Design a protein around this ligand. Sequence first.
Ligand SMILES: [Fe+3]
Ligand SMILES: [Fe+3]
Ligand SMILES: [Fe+3]
Ligand SMILES: [Fe+3]
Lengths: 124, 124, 124, 124
Amino acid sequence: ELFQTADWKKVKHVPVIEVLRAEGGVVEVKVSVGKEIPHPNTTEHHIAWIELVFQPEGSKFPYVVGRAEFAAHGASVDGPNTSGVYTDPVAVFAFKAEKSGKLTAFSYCNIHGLWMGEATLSLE
Amino acid sequence: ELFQTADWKKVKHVPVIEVLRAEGGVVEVKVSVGKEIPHPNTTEHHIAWIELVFQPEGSKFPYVVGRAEFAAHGASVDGPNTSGVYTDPVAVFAFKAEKSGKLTAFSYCNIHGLWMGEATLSLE
Amino acid sequence: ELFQTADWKKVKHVPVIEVLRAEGGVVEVKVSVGKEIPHPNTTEHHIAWIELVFQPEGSKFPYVVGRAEFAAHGASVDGPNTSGVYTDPVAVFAFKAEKSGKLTAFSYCNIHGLWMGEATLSLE
Amino acid sequence: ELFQTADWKKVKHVPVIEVLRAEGGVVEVKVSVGKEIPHPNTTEHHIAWIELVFQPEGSKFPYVVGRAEFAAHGASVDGPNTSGVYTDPVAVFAFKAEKSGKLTAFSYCNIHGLWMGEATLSLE
Ligand SMILES: [Fe+3]
Ligand SMILES: [Fe+3]
Ligand SMILES: [Fe+3]
Ligand SMILES: [Fe+3]
């Protein structure tokens, strides 16, 4: 087939990793799930967390940078989707670094399993 | 006594809340520890996490918005402070809201205990 | 009033802390929310986590021992309460210790706010 | 080569899964790291957490059962390894199930990377 495509079902779930700042080992990395191309956030269906791993070149092992839980999905004493409060599955991880390396991010849908994305961090 | 003062040690640790955006429900809140006075980030001594709580006016109960773990503090197989990777204790909680309310932030130093901060969310 | 009572609404939410073993600084502490006196675990209503703090005598500061998220509340692609999988809001924290002290536990209902319980750990 | 061997370093780190009870849906799973060969728990080097994933047969997706953070590693204001408080890397996930399935556990050393373990849940 000449026409290439992509499953929307997958795209709305991948943790998209975007480096924002990396001047002089001062790094700010944003991860979101469905940035402008959105995944539902209901009491029954939501992204629960995102986790970010970084492995600097010449490091035998990878390091977890941090983890971000998105705790609120509209539940209240009046029923599901009534609180008004919904946490958005975007996180910014700010960290120091002395070398370039690989970034890997993980996310979780409460009904659609575990997901992963990768990206490169080169020190500009 | 008579001569009031301010503990520098206390401000080094307080989670500071900074609303960045509240227009039209779309809220973004920055929390950070050590903003004005730098808090150590060494394998020995560092800020472990920040949790954001929000209670909209009208609601009898508060909701956790989310939690952010800051996991790297320079430990490698080479020893303490040798990995050159340190997660900065600062998070951005993005979330949808439909009423104004109260923001409480908590935070933890691995040697200096638990910490609390407060702020008002004016959904103007 | 001669007759004393207690709100059931509160009891089903308090983190009950029970020391199981403490021989020689080898400590095992169990925390549950509504042990035989149960709190609902539905996709809309559930206990999200329990956290355990310990402060040993003669320690200026308290230490978080650990935290236990209960991630599964029956949600699946077929709707709420269909997965068959529900995590029980009980956790065991095993840890070492050299002195007696105070235990404090925290729990979270997703629609009924934050809760706390206290207990003493003496080293037998 | 020709002479197969087993890495002692690898077993020190593997999360080991142990079903304790599965009768009638009521499951309890112990996960631990360093069961047979002790893994260091020092401020410098220690196991940060364990996460349990479960995928019942029939279900297209896995569910996180829960996560357990092990937060204390002896750090005090007096320095490294001086608090005399260390969280043992071992958790008990209790949960209700209605079908047999697959158990995957993950775990993290602050200097020796991420780790994975597997086991079958026979809801006999
Ligand atoms: Fe999904
Ligand atoms: Fe401190
Ligand atoms: Fe409740
Ligand atoms: Fe290790």
